[PDB]
């Protein structure tokens, strides 16, 4: 049995955490934990549980040393093999910080200076000060070819385009967790240019993209362009070598609504930070109400790229972020606008569009973001509003109970990873992390430790306790992706990838092993702001809750 076969959280364990490793295959009967320094025997485990998934004949053996609670460095010996690990406070803090700092590396329109960036420094790229109104985006005062400035914001992912749906959703998710852990985020410092101001660094980072988002709203009708893009994806070149023309394209109802929701949300969160962000809270709220108004007038204005390409030139072939179901965006936006303005007219829209069931958050399914807003503590809800919130809590708990059913008997001892349908493009964020986030919220709503225990299990999975043995976050753990599908990492002249990115993961042989660490793997090794938003959400909340 190779050392390789011992699958565990490669960052380590909190002192009071469940502590489980899984041997991926082979006959095992016993394991031992040793103090790495003193050489003292600390724990011996026997009578070990084993299990198999439906699709793999490998015998997975569970090693449970949860009773070891003293901080320190330890050695796990199983048969021939061994691995060292740490038990320590704040074990996920470097992960939470790196996940947030990834957004800094994605920033456009500014130099990425070594002081903050380390070896992954670069010159400014994509100023986006000379951007064309695409014919699909034309308005009376802005005919096709009009030049606008639409600067700042993040690169979306492995490509260099900027998308309102995905970035609005991403901020919406991170700012949901922010609101639960104000002290945590106030104290967090991640060495970005804004680390010495008076504003929590998470909010500084969000604002870098929020400021860009404001420029994507037509100052007349209030509508919001779906994305800022080149016509084609660029090759794997540095930002300074990119030469395609940049366009803003067709206004969409989902762009308008995700803009409205996140701007209404942001209005509240930045109210205290007029010093560093003067006027933003007020501007965001005004902008939000205008965007929501536009969406009301154009409720079925979906972004269909194929149809756009039949009517307009140049053809656009970058990320679609298409959706013909806007009820959830209406729900999230109306909910945020209700909480920011108090107006009953927005409440009624939220109630009309309420979800019947809880589903985890995703870029095109924003029901959960609305639900999180309704479930927020400290907000003094009236009888009807409390009754509504209570009904949403019930649905969250129904979802959570179903997710955790049988989790302790799974091969990898987590709710995520024992169903073939768990594996697909971006699954580690979309399902594993966001299932974790959902479980963390269920803990917050009930105080039932079992939900939180299961959230940590899903985190252990992405950090190495899985079928491949990868810690699926660049720059962290023992065996992590060195070749992400990421134009920034691939085109710099630095061997190690930019750190802190969650790769998409296995995406179909065994479905949970359908992963390749190569730069051409869009299918399994892509990185993205919405995937990192999930990682920031789960890692930050699990670290904050550990104390
Ligand atoms: Ca700051
Ligand atoms: Ca939707
Ligand atoms: Cl691109
Ligand atoms: Cl779901
Ligand atoms: Mg590189």
Taking the C-alpha atoms of residue 102 and residue 112, their distance in angstroms, rounded to an integer, is 12
The tokens of 301 are what?
A: 């204005």
- Among the candidates 44, 70, 89, a domain finishes at 89
Backbone angles phi, psi at 47, to 5 degrees: 55, 55
Which residues lie across from 85 on neighbouring strands?
74
Q: Which residues pair with 128 in a beta bridge?
A: none
| Residues 82 and 97 both lie in one domain | no
Residues 6 or more apart whose CB falls under 8 angstroms from that of 372 comprise 176, 441
How does DSSP classify residue 177? H
By DSSP bridging, strand 247-248 and strand 131-133 are: parallel
- Report which of 173, 161, 31 is spatially closest to residue 537, judged by C-alpha positions: 173
Nearest in space to 507 (alpha carbons), one of 533, 476, 485: 485
Going from the Cα of 162 to the center of ligand 3, the distance in angstroms, rounded, reads 9
C-beta neighbour count of 514 within 10 angstroms: 17
List phi, psi (to 5°) of 408.
Answer: -75, -15
Instruction: Please state, in angstroms and rounded to a whole number, the distance separating the CA atoms of residues 308 and 368.
Output: 30
Resolution (A): 1.4
Beta-sheet pairing, 147-148 with 72-78: unpaired
Q: How far apart, in Å, are the Cα atoms of 61 and each of 22, 51, 90, 305, 410?
A: 5, 7, 28, 48, 10
Return d(Cα 324, Cα 341) in angstroms, integer.
28
**Integer Cα distance of 379 and 372 in angstroms:** 12
Q: Tell me: cis bond preceding 318? Omega within 30 of 0 counts.
A: no
**59 and 137 inside one domain:** no
131 with 77, same domain? no
Q: How many residues does the chain have?
A: 547
Residue 112 Cα to ligand 2 midpoint, Å, equals: 34
Instruction: Measure Cα distances from 241 to 123, 125, 152, 236, 396 in Å.
Output: 11, 9, 18, 10, 47
**Residues forming the active site:** 159, 485, 517, 526
* Way it was determined: X-ray
CA of 515 to the centre of ligand 5 (A): 20
C-alpha of residue 117 to centroid of ligand 1, in Å: 16
Distances (CA, A) of 297 to 263, 308, 329: 19, 20, 15
For 21, the domain range is: 1-89
CA–CA distance, 531 with 537 (Å, rounded to integer): 10
Q: Rounded to an integer, what distance in angstroms lies between the CA atom of residue 115 and that of residue 102?
A: 15
197 and 68, same structural domain? Answer: no
Measured in whole angstroms, how far is the alpha carbon of residue 401 from the centre of its chain? 23
Contact 362, 425 (CB under 8 A): no
3-class secondary-structure state, position 165: helix
Domain total of the chain: 2
Those residues with Cβ within 8 angstroms of residue 358's Cβ, 6 or more apart along the chain or in another chain: 367, 368, 371, 392, 395, 396, 398, 399, 438
Counting ligands in written order, the one closest to the CA of 370 is 2
Which residues on adjacent β-strands are paired with residue 112?
Answer: 122
One domain, residues 1 and 142: no
What are the DSSP calls for 418-469, one per residue?
SSGGG-STTHIIIIIIHHHHHHHHHHHHH--HHHHHHHHHHHHHHTT-SSS-
- Measured in Å, how far apart are the chain's first and last C-alpha atoms? 37
Query: Token pair for residue 199?
Result: 């504003």
Secondary structure E strands in 24-80: 30-35, 41-46, 50-51, 60-64, 72-78
Query: Ligand 4 mean position to 3 CA, how many Å?
Result: 35
Please give the distance, rounded to the nearest whole angstrom, from the Cα atom of residue 362 to the centre of ligand 2. 9
Distance in angstroms (rounded) separating the CA atoms of residues 63 and 55: 22
Residue 120: closest CA among 500, 540, 471: 500
Chain centroid to Cα 511, Å, comes to: 22
Q: Under DSSP, is residue 242 helix (H, G, I), strand (E, B) or coil?
A: coil
For the chain, the maximum distance between any two Cα atoms, rounded to a whole number of angstroms, is 78
Residue 7 shares a structural domain with residue 27: yes
User: Strand order in 162-163's β-sheet?
Assistant: 147-148, 131-133, 247-248, 227-229, 162-163
Tell me, yes or no, whether 369 and 412 share the same domain: yes
How many whole angstroms separate alpha carbon 42 and alpha carbon 75?
10
Do 468 and 517 belong to one domain?
A: yes
153 in the same domain as 71: no
Do 79 and 160 fall into the same domain? no
- Boundary-marking domain end, from 89, 116, 133: 89
Burial 318-334 (b: 16+ CB within 10 A, else e): bbbbbbeebebbbbbbb
Ligand nearest to the backbone CA of 368: 4
The number of the ligand nearest the C-alpha atom of 363 reads 2
Q: Return the structure tokens found at 81.
A: 């093999």
Residue 427, sorted as left (phi over 0), alpha (psi -120 to 50) or beta, turns out to be alpha
Query: Strand (E) positions, 231-355?
Result: 247-248
Tokens at residue 84, please? 């060292």
- Indicate if 163 and 134 belong to the same structural domain: yes
Report which of 69, 91, 92, 81 is spatially closest to residue 32, judged by C-alpha positions. 81
Query: Which domain-ending residue is among 74, 89, 104?
Result: 89
Q: Which ligand has the shortest distance to the CA of 230?
A: 3
Kindly state whether residues 310 and 322 are assigned to the same domain.
Answer: yes
For residue 477, the CA-to-ligand 5 centroid distance in Å is 18
Q: Is 427 exposed, middle or buried (0-12, 13-18, 19+ CB in 10 A)?
A: buried
Tell me phi and psi for residue 531, to 5 degrees: -75, -40
């Amino acid at each position: 049995i190779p050392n390789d076969a011992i699958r565990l959280n490669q960052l380590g364990y909190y002192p009071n955490q469940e502590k489980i490793a899984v041997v991926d295959s082979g006959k095992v009967e016993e394991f031992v934990i040793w103090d790495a320094v003193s050489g003292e025997q600390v724990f011996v485990g026997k009578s070990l549980y084993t299990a198999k998934s439906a699709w793999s004949d490998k015998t997975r053996t569970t090693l449970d040393f949860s009773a070891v609670t003293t901080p320190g460095k330890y050695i796990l010996k199983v048969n021939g093999a061994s691995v060292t690990f740490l038990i320590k406070d704040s074990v996920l803090s470097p992960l939470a910080d790196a996940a947030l700092k990834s957004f800094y590396y994605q920033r456009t329109a500014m130099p990425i200076e070594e002081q903050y960036a380390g070896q992954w420094h670069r010159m400014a790229g994509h100023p986006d000060n000379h951007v064309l109104i695409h014919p699909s985006a034309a308005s009376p005062d802005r005919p096709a070819g009009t030049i606008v400035s639409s600067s700042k914001g993040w690169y979306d992912a492995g490509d260099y385009n900027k998308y309102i749906v995905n970035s609005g959703y991403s901020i919406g998710l991170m700012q949901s967790i922010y609101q639960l852990f104000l002290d945590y985020f106030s104290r967090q410092k991640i060495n970005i240019p804004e680390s010495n101001n008076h504003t929590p660094d998470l909010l500084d980072e969000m604002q870098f993209n929020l400021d860009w988002m404001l420029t994507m709203q037509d100052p007349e009708d209030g509508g919001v362009y779906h994305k800022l893009t080149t016509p084609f994806f660029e090759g794997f070149v540095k930002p300074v070598d990119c030469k395609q023309q940049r366009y803003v394209v067709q206004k969409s109802v989902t762009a308008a609504l995700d803009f409205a929701a996140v701007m209404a949300q942001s209005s509240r969160l930045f109210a205290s930070y007029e010093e560093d962000y003067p006027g933003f809270s007020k501007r965001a709220l005004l902008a939000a109400e205008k965007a929501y108004a536009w969406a009301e007038k154009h409720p079925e204005a979906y972004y269909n790229q194929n149809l756009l390409n039949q009517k307009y030139q140049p053809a656009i072939a970058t990320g679609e972020y298409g959706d013909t179901h806007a009820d959830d965006e209406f729900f999230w936006a109306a909910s945020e606008l209700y909480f920011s303005t108090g107006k009953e007219i927005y409440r009624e829209e939220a109630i009309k569009k309420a979800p019947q069931i809880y589903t985890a958050p995703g870029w095109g399914n924003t029901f959960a973001l609305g639900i999180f807003a309704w479930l927020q503590p400290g907000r003094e809800l009236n009888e009807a509003d409390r009754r509504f919130a209570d009904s949403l809590k019930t649905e969250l708990l129904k979802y959570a109970d179903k997710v955790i059913e049988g989790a302790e008997q799974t091969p990898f001892h987590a709710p995520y990873g024992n169903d073939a349908k768990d594996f697909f493009w971006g699954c580690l964020a979309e399902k594993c992390m966001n299932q974790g986030v959902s479980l963390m919220y269920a803990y917050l709503q009930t105080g039932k430790d079992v939900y939180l225990t299961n959230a940590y299990r899903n985190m252990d999975y992405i950090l190495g306790r899985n079928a491949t043995g990868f810690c699926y976050v660049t720059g962290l753990g023992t065996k992590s992706p060195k070749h992400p599908h990421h134009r920034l990492s691939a085109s710099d002249d630095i061997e190690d990838p930019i750190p802190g990115f969650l790769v998409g993961g296995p995406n179909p042989a065994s479905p949970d092993e359908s992963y390749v660490d190569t730069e051409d793997s869009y299918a399994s090794n892509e990185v993205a702001i919405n995937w990192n938003a999930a990682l920031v959400a789960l890692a930050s909340s699990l670290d904050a809750l550990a104390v």
